[PDB]
Structures are given as C-alpha cells and as structure tokens.
C-alpha cells in the first residue's frame, strides 16, 4: 500500500466544498462544446457519498426539466474542476436514493441551516 501512497497522495483535490447525503451539489465538469471552453452548471443534491479519498464520490442530483441526465462524479478527478454550493441538505442516513422519485411539489427538503 505504501507504493501508490506517495504516488496519489498528491492527486486528490485541494479545496472541496460542503455537502451531506442530500446536500445540494453542482460539479462544474469541463465538457466539450464548439472550440472554446466554459463552465456549465449541474446543480443537485447528494443521494450517495463515497469517503474513499481520490477515487471517492460526492453526489449531484439535478432536475433536468423533467428528465435528468444522472451523474456519478469523481470528486478527486481534475475533470471535476470545482464545486460551488447553493445550499446544503438536511439528511439522516448515508444514501439518498429517495432524492429521485421525490418530485415537484414535495420534491424539496428543508435546509439543514445549522
């Protein structure tokens, strides 16, 4: 284990934001459009988190004007440039698989504004 330990001890991200399983999340993932680069939003909640270091995860659940295109990010892949928080969530458990089918008028959860 002490082999890659120094290898990738220098490849995990540098300044990741605040979330919970159910905190609102948006991974600005630099994607291919035309001939220039820009940032495009993917704002959502975490339903599923992986505290695994570089190969870990922090989950974003958007709503794509009715049908989303769902994303399993790498927090520590530089393809995730950064995260900018709009609000965190109030969660109990570890994995918010419920965040999906929960929609429209009730789809909300309050802010865990503490």
């Amino acid at each position: 284990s002490n082999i890659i330990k120094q290898l990738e001890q220098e490849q995990m991200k540098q300044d990741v934001p605040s979330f919970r399983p159910g905190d609102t999340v948006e991974v600005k993932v630099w994607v291919v459009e035309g001939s220039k680069k820009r940032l495009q939003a993917f704002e959502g909640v975490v339903i599923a988190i992986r505290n695994r270091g570089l190969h870990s995860a922090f989950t974003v659940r958007k709503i794509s004007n009715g049908e989303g295109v769902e994303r399993v990010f790498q927090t520590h892949s530089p393809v995730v440039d950064s995260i900018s928080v709009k609000r965190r969530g109030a969660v109990r458990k570890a994995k918010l698989y419920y965040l999906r089918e929960r929609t429209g008028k009730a789809a909300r959860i309050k802010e865990r504004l503490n």
Binding site: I3, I4, L7, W30, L54, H76, S77, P78, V79
Partner: protein
C-alpha cells in the same frame, strides 16, 4: 532493451493536468542483476542470468551461498536469463539500473495470474446459458454436448473443457506506455498487469514492434 518485471504492487488511476485518467499497473522492481555468461562461449547460445531482490542472511545456502559466494553477491529473489540479441550480452554478477526502458512505448506482462482454482467453464470460455425455466431438467450450467456418434466416436484433443485456469504465468505484450519513476522503481501503466496483485509478471519492451 530487455524487459523489467516487478512485484504487482497494486494499481491506481493516474490523474493528470487536462482531464486525463490513467488507471495504471503498480509494480516493484529493484536494481536488477545479471549473474552469469550464456552465449557461444560457455553454452553456445547467449543469455543473461539475472536475480533481483534480497534474502535474509541466514537463508543463503552454502552452495547457493557459494552460488552467490562464487557470485560474491547479495541474494536476489530470482535469476532470469535475457537471451542475448547480438546487442544483448552479459556476464556474471552485475547489479542493474532501469534506464533500459528509456522510450519502449510498449512493454510486457507475464506471470502468475489471480488465484482461481477450478474456475467454471462459463467463465473460462464465455459459453452460454440454457433457459432457467419451462421444464429445465437440472441443467442450468452444464457444458452440454461435446462430441459426435458412432462415427469417429472419440474426443478431439484440445477441446475447450472446463477446469482450473489462470493463477499462472501470462504474457502481456505490446502494451502502451504511461509512466514510471526510476527514483522509486514503480511501473504505472494505462492498463493493469495480470496475476494476483503483488505478483511478478514479465514486462518487456514490445515484441510486436
């Protein structure tokens, strides 16, 4: 440029500057050693016998002690011949550097694969499944028919039969290059070498050119 093989440290996904993902093999190779002359002169065919690694003082047995005593060398984990390619040519006893993969652009992997014992035939060869219902008579995984009738009536040699497979030497050649650290003696490669993790697998510059 002979190949250099290591202990299958483990593996990683190597992260880059512009969104590049490199899940690479992780392997250990110490300063290698060629330990004998093989050629016309003493055998008529040319080869370079090489041991690498170390052994605990008490366990270097006198003749092998003498083998290394006659060698006058530290113990290494095993002596390998590199067949001399008319530019390849060594003699007993040298402790080696790794620069021999300066460019390569592709190397090998050959060694004991993951332990499996009797693997199932469904896995060894990608056979098919029968249906799981509508009267299946206890045949959810059998291989099915194998051969013919009163005509030749014998089983052709080589027929792909289920059984133990893997957990053994496995040549993996013509393999793209990703990265190394000579200063650390790792080998980190897009694509991960066979065998059990921690294994040695023959990594050699490409023989498919």
């Amino acid at each position: 440029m002979i190949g250099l093989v290591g202990k299958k440290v483990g593996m990683t996904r190597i992260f880059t500057e512009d969104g590049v993902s490199i899940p690479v093999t992780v392997i250990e190779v110490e300063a290698n050693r060629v330990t004998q002359v093989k050629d016309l002169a003493n055998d008529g065919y040319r080869a370079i016998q090489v041991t690498t690694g170390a052994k605990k003082a008490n366990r270097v047995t006198k003749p092998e002690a003498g083998h290394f005593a006659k060698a006058g060398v530290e113990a290494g984990r095993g002596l390998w011949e590199f067949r001399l390619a008319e530019g390849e040519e060594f003699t007993v006893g040298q402790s080696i550097s790794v620069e021999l993969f300066a460019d390569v652009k592709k190397v090998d992997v050959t060694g004991t694969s993951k332990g499996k014992g009797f693997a199932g035939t469904v896995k060894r060869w990608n056979f098919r499944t029968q249906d799981a219902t509508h009267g299946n008579s206890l045949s959810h995984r059998v291989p099915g028919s194998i051969g013919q009738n009163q005509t030749p009536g014998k089983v052709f040699k080589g027929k792909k039969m289920a059984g133990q497979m893997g957990n053994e030497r496995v040549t993996v050649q013509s393999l793209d290059v990703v990265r190394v650290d000579a200063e650390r003696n790792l080998l980190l490669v897009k694509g991960a070498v066979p065998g059990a993790t921690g294994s040695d697998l023959i990594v050699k510059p490409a023989v498919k050119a």
